Design a protein around this ligand. Structure first.
Ligand code: NI
Ligand code: NI
Ligand code: NI
Lengths: 320, 204
């Protein structure tokens, strides 16, 4: 229980939190761990430190009581702070809860009760305080309130005050939060398809269609690798996809697939598995992809044909 | 595709069980079937999967089928039946059931989560041997899988700058050996792993 002298004043700090994955529930995350705001051996002007928010309704810089607590009785507890977090690359904004409390310091006594930021002062064993500590933290489970992984940022401003007296400065705290979401992978076809089949020269036909798709894998991760498989039930171990006349298993027609996914192009056989290096609660934004179907058929019998294709999404084993 | 799953990967340890939730972004109610495959020879070129019943297989997955209301999520419970001596890896597929001249091609998305069934005390042991070609082989002695990134081949006990570096980024699973493909006769090796081990290299 040894403390150094210190005078309060404006401060600027940066606090980094995590990496924390989104998948597991957020634990408690410390922004300040009983940070010393003031202390003094000789006098007792730091016997009633209060910490006020700039606005009580404005969440930009944290919203919490902006005035000294009215009653003589202390408020034992924590102060709730609503603070606006902005993801860096999207500029999307979400408001999270922050918990804050002070703690008073006495020369000859130890009385460590937690007080709300604007709470009134007290004396321990009829002794006045000499300084105060300040703790601020993200509660458990708060980072799971964020809609998607990414670098979320915020700035907190608290005024440092002697209660019902002079304001000493303003603490600006820069809080960066690195959310991970590593187990997050999705695919969407924003919109079954028809190959719009038409004849060509020689009794040949040609059809071509394509589906646009939404595709995402959990980000701010390290480089990850995924596995995709394309299969047709009417898989004969050829590696070829087939369309059988409905009602006529005897007749088969052949078609092919190609996929451009986020700038990368591939044609898969029927049963092949493809690794995708990503270097090449879930999130809506998606890197673009397009599966394209194609077919060339000569002398084909009329009547409809149908084809079903399973596209399996998996992490692969030959990864890290 | 009208759904998604969280999560894509999970490790079950200590006999404890975890959950994989399935999300409906369709507004029309759907039915999901769940089934598991055990992965044989994982990390290798002869890797294959085979079906296991849901109760007497390494892992127990409940439920096997679900009603997926629109915009809601169900929960699927993964728990290890019996903790295993060495790591085991499974895939749990989430397919959907949709049954109630032209061409119609219905397109369908299936998710398979990669689940590691982990052993009780985790150890990693890497043994080196040399191949007929005299290439250097790495056997996973350790129960848990290896995950090597790069291998600094070395002329002598200390690395310096004359030692060859080749990056691999390939996992090594227990009881499996991996050929680095090198037949020249270096003395040691240094290995980094995903989150500096030094070992002698056999000249046989
Ligand atoms: Ni009162
Ligand atoms: Ni583009
Ligand atoms: Ni449920």
């Amino acid at each position: 229980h040894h403390h150094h002298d210190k005078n309060p004043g404006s401060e600027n700090m940066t606090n980094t939190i995590g990496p924390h994955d989104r998948g597991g529930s957020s634990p408690i995350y410390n922004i300040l761990n009983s940070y010393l705001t003031a202390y003094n051996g000789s006098h007792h002007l730091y016997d009633r430190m209060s910490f006020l928010c700039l606005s009580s309704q404005n969440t930009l810089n944290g919203a919490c009581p902006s005035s000294d607590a009215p009653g003589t009785a202390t408020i034992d507890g924590e102060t709730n702070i609503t603070l606006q977090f902005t993801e860096k690359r999207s500029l999307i904004k979400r408001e999270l809860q922050i918990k804050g409390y002070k703690q008073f310091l006495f020369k000859n006594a130890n009385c460590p009760s937690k007080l709300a930021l604007n709470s009134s002062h007290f004396q321990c064993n009829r002794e006045q305080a000499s300084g105060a500590t300040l703790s601020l933290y993200i509660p458990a489970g708060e980072l799971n309130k964020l809609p998607f992984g990414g670098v979320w940022n915020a700035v907190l401003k608290l005024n440092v005050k002697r209660r019902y007296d002079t304001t000493y400065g303003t603490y600006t705290i820069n809080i960066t939060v690195n959310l991970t979401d590593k187990g997050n992978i999705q695919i969407w076809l924003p919109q079954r398809v028809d190959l719009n089949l038409r004849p060509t020269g020689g009794g040949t036909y040609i059809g071509r269609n394509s589906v646009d798709m939404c595709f995402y894998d959990g980000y701010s991760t390290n480089s990850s690798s995924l596995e995709i498989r394309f299969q047709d039930d009417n898989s004969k171990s050829d590696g070829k996809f087939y369309l059988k006349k409905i009602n006529d298993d005897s007749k088969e027609l052949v078609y092919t697939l190609s996929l451009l996914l986020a700038g990368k192009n591939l044609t898969p056989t029927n049963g092949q598995a493809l690794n995708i290096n990503t270097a090449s609660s879930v999130p809506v934004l998606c890197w673009p992809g397009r599966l394209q179907l194609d077919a060339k058929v000569k002398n084909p019998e009329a009547g409809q044909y149908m084809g079903n294709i399973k596209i399996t999404f998996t992490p692969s084993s030959q990864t890290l | 595709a009208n759904f998604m799953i969280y999560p894509i990967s999970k490790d079950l340890k200590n006999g404890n069980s975890e959950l994989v939730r399935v999300y409906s972004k369709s507004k029309e109610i759907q039915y999901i079937k769940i089934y598991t495959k055990k992965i044989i020879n994982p990390g290798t070129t002869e890797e294959y999967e085979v079906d296991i019943p849901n109760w007497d297989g390494g892992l127990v997955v409940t439920p096997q089928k679900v009603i997926l209301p629109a915009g809601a999520s169900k929960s699927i419970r993964l728990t290890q039946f019996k903790i295993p001596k060495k790591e085991e890896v499974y895939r749990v597929y989430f397919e959907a059931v949709k049954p109630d001249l032209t061409i119609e091609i219905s397109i369908n998305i299936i998710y398979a989560a990669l689940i590691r069934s982990l052993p009780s005390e985790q150890n990693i042991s890497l043994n080196i041997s040399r191949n007929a070609k005299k290439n250097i082989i790495i056997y996973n002695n350790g129960n848990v899988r290896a995950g090597v990134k790069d291998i600094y081949f070395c002329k002598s006990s200390n690395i310096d700058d004359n030692c060859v570096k080749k990056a691999y980024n390939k996992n090594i699973y227990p009881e499996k050996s991996f050929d680095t493909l090198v037949n020249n006769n270096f003395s040691y090796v240094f290995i980094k792993l995903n989150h500096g081990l030094i070992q002698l290299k056999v000249p046989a």
